[PDB]
Design a protein around this ligand. Structure first.
Ligand SMILES: NC(=O)CC[C@H](N)C(=O)O
Ligand SMILES: NC(=O)CC[C@H](N)C(=O)O
Lengths: 387, 387
């Protein structure tokens, strides 16, 4: 019934060219590399190479072929997605991109000298929604590190594995009010939130306490690959050798936490700190990070594969934490102006989240003095002012 | 001559569809992702949206567009490549693949427990030639570590940076006749050859001695990416956390070499050993490794980019070393039967090289007791018996 509906949308011809069939199929934003339509793409190849004719659509083959992806095609082609007129949305995104390109900023990275090798004019924005509508511009294919942008993800790991009460037995859930590098605890001698460095160290201590570092990294990498829909998730070893021989404030924070005895029993501080460095050393592209902040923009389900990834409790908790203290000292101003859950990092990534609507990633090596990208902040302000 | 080339390609008809142009390119074995034809690919892209005819190539657009790759296109379309009749060559490869799939083998990996998680039935073969002709089958897209296969590459890098006399001031050029884990030196208290573990450690000690590991890894990764034509050269951190907590023979070998004072002056043993582990922990796919062993099959020129990577002296030296002692104690039998320069690996990769013709890669997790893949050895024997 969907093929005759599309024929009614068509100009009255039974046969339509495939190279024109892909048009108005990408106009709704659904890409041709979706694993949901992997059966559709392989059957389309099997029809395309073994015809030598072209301009062939057919109706009975289209009826008998797809039985589970019919609902996705009907939702996409009837403008039943969350965001219609996606060409206009991409036009707005491109206009905001060109407006934010005028800013200059500066001061990319003093410490972590491997991070200072990026040119200051790099700029890219990726967009991915709940249904699977995705679009990206700029330098979205260039890999970049996930410094401090993995902290909400690893907090979700800890919560979904061990229960929120056991997770918050060792950490608080309040904003610190100071820089993330500054070391101090609350009245109960605990880190203020998982987003600061001390809370990140403590929540790395929780994940899979009974196994070695290799199995821990394998588990978190496999699960994050499941969350990303098997996208590109690398590991920048060049930025891991740096920040290990040059990152001294994190070592001081870890030794302070060890001295304050706020660790789980039978835990080695040095190995946990090295594991935290390894988690900070993960690198993804902007397109790959568009799938990030979109599984948690949904109800814990992957926007592309639809698999069960995170429990809704973990997603709600990490969304609340990102809304509260996800932008260091700029969190209050960000909630005042933008009012959306977002996480930043010294690499230049912004994990902007719109709940139940869409996800977004912005990448810009220049940084503000508080540790946030100026171009991404201006882009977010323009986006919340326009839409 | 380009009109005459089109007259040779066509059968006499002026109208040639894009479907006819996109076929017989895979017959020539030149893939669409070649940066040499990147301007031709850009022409194809711009004429896919703007041709005003639909499924048409036209003579005049091809005349006015190709302005730097006339020689490559003319050599490709007149069967001037080193390997003609690529369909027969791929059929031979498929027959050898089916013959080698019958064997079982066993004994995947005992130590490095992260390496033991691979499936024993995984099997893939990738092929690339000097001109750029390539073909792959099986599991060619699954990444795997480059354990013991990066040693000729790092040896070539060290030779290119330093000079043969300065490289061999510390390392001999003779086979050992024992396993790579055996802890002994020659009469002059030196490692026997760069292929074994001690020689690999010493030649890692020589690359950029005055610079820390953070920029050394970036340097060697830049050279590897230039050799690979910007293909997928990843880093498996899971297999780097393992083999560091469990690799004990390498630590004993390094401490023995430090005691024998064969290291360069002012060199830390632990940091160089960690850098060696990092260099062994680099992971690639079968296709990306097939891009390798073709630059050194050529005179140091990358088959894909066409640039210059390695000096001919380094290429000749590493080819001679791989021919002499590139298969551990099985090197004599390999030269007796196959007689081609190949490098083995505990991961399962085989870096089979045919000089000035074509490069290869065979990937099989099961291993013989000597330290080589059984399926790869059988495949090499069948290949040298057939062609
Ligand atoms: N923003 C962070 O704290 C993580 C990255 C930072 N450079 C660090 O490791 O201290
Ligand atoms: N074949 C090998 O020896 C490589 C395994 C490990 N990298 C080692 O040096 O021992």
């Amino acid at each position: 019934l969907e093929d005759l509906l599309f024929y009614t949308i068509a100009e009255g011809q039974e046969k339509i060219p495939v190279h024109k069939f892909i048009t108005a199929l990408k106009s709704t934003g659904l890409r041709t590399s979706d694993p949901r339509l992997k059966e559709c793409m392989d059957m389309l190849r099997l029809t395309l190479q073994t015809t030598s004719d072209g301009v062939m659509l057919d109706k009975d083959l289209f009826k008998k072929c797809v039985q589970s992806n019919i609902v996705l095609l009907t939702q996409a082609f009837r403008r039943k997605f969350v965001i219609p007129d996606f060409m206009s949305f991409t036009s707005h995104i491109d206009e905001l991109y060109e407006s934010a390109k005028k800013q200059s900023g500066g001061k990319v990275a003093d410490y972590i000298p491997q991070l200072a090798k990026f040119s200051p004019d790099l700029w890219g924005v990726s967009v991915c929604t709940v249904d699977g509508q995705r679009h990206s511009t700029g330098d979205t294919k260039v890999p970049f590190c996930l410094q401090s942008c993995v902290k909400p993800l690893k907090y979700a790991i800890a919560v979904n594995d061990l229960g929120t009460e056991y997770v918050h037995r060792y950490v608080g859930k309040e904003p610190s009010g100071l820089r993330f590098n500054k070391l101090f605890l609350n009245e109960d001698d605990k880190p203020h939130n998982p987003m600061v460095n001390a809370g990140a160290i403590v929540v790395t201590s929780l994940i899979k306490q009974g196994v070695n570092n290799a199995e821990k990294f394998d588990y978190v990498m496999q699960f994050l690959n499941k969350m990303a829909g098997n996208e590109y998730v690398g590991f920048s070893n060049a930025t891991f050798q740096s920040e290990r021989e040059s990152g001294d404030r994190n070592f001081a924070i870890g030794y302070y936490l060890k001295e304050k005895k706020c660790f789980p029993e039978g835990t080695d501080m040095v190995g946990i700190l090295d594991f935290y460095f390894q988690l900070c050393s993960i690198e993804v592209t902007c397109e790959s990070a568009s799938v990030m902040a979109a599984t948690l923009a949904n109800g814990g389900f992957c926007p592309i594969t639809g698999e069960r990834v995170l429990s809704p409790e973990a997603v709600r908790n990490t969304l609340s934490l990102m809304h509260s203290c996800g932008m260091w000292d700029f969190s209050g101003q960000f909630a005042f102006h933008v009012g959306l859950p977002a996480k930043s990092g010294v690499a230049g990534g912004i994990l902007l989240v719109v709940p139940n609507v869409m996800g977004m990633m912005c990448w810009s090596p220049p940084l503000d003095k508080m540790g946030n990208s100026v171009k991404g902040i201006h882009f977010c302000h323009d986006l919340v002012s326009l839409c």
